[PDB]
């Protein structure tokens, strides 16, 4: 029933609307969700999907970029 990426009991929903960090983080928060945790997803198959989308630390998952827009995943436990 996870319409997105399923990993270790969590469900990652792709939001393809480009948003600034605050707006993305607030969007997930309202959906009872968080942004992805960089260290959780970095050494998994999820990295190919989540790369250069907003992490919970405020940066794109891998110069200053806090004023730019990125896509984002909302993460919610099952």
């Amino acid at each position, epitope marked *: 029933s996870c319409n997105g990426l399923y990993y270790q009991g969590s469900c990652y929903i792709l939001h393809s609307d*480009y*948003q*600034m*960090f*605050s707006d993305a*983080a607030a969007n997930c928060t309202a959906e009872s969700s968080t942004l992805p945790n960089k260290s959780d997803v970095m050494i998994t198959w999820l990295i190919d999907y989540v790369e250069d989308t907003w992490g*919970s*630390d*405020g*940066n794109p998952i891998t*110069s*200053d970029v*806090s*004023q*730019e*827009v990125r896509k984002y995943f909302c993460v919610k436990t099952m």
Partner: antibody, heavy 116, light 114 residues
Framework: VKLVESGGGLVQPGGSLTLSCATSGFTFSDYYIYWVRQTPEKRLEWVAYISNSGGNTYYSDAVKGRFTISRDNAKNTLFLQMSRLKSEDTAVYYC??????????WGQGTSVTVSS | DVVMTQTPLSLPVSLGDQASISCRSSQSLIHTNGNTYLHWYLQKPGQSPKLLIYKVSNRFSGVPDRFSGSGSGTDFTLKISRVEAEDLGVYFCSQSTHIPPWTFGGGTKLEIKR
């Protein structure tokens, strides 16, 4: 790095006006850009903000629904379409490039005056 | 709706003296990314604003050692170790942590003391 505003002039209330901001010395489509105005009180007030591609736009509450920020990446030019102009919109209008979280390079400005 | 409050409005300084300008935000400017997005601009008469210091304490290109930014959270300071004639004009602090809107301090006019 250069940014040059133009199109500033005298308009009547309810009138319309388009400002331009020609750029030089950097790859234009790689940079997000602001419009910032300086009031007669000489205060700085943010107006609008556009993404590098132009897919995202943001407006201050005071110009929301009246002003339109757009860009032409082929012409290295930024635009500010102003409609339903009020005396409150009287200002010097600056375009400013975003870098490092800040506004690193500004044009010389173009002057707008709304009066009957 | 982050209010930037600058003091003083005018700062009378003589040449060679140190100057310090205060800028205070209505809420903390610490970004979840660890950085703090407070910036300082200088506007000379008949000129547009130019960037002096970005992210609290980083001097922009061509900006001399005598300008130093500091502070944290809600309280920030611009220091000019020794005031020169070319420094005269209006200094503006700005925040880009809680956006939109991007907001500016009211400004501090550096002036000659006689």
């Amino acid at each position: 790095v250069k940014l040059v505003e133009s199109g500033g002039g005298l308009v009547q209330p309810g009138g319309s006006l388009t400002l331009s901001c020609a750029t030089s010395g950097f790859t234009f489509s790689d940079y997000y850009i602001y419009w910032v105005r300086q009031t007669p009180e000489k205060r700085l007030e943010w107006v609008a903000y556009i993404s590098n591609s132009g897919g995202n736009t943001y407006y201050s509450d005071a110009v929301k629904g009246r002003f339109t920020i757009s860009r032409d990446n082929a012409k290295n030019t930024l635009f500010l379409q102003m409609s339903r102009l009020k005396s409150e919109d009287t200002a010097v209008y600056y375009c400013a490039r975003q870098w490092g979280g800040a506004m690193d390079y500004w044009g010389q400005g173009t002057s707008v005056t709304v009066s009957s | 709706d982050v209010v930037m409050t600058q003091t003083p409005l005018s700062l009378p300084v003589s040449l060679g003296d140190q100057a310090s300008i205060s800028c205070r935000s209505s809420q903390s400017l610490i970004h979840t990314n660890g950085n703090t997005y407070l910036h300082w601009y200088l506007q000379k008469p008949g000129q547009s604003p130019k960037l002096l210091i970005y992210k609290v304490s980083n001097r922009f290109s061509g900006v001399p050692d005598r300008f130093s930014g500091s502070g944290s959270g809600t309280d920030f300071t611009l220091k000019i170790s020794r005031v020169e004639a070319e420094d005269l004009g209006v200094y503006f602090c700005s925040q880009s942590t809680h956006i939109p809107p991007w907001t500016f301090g009211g400004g501090t006019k550096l002036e000659i003391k006689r």
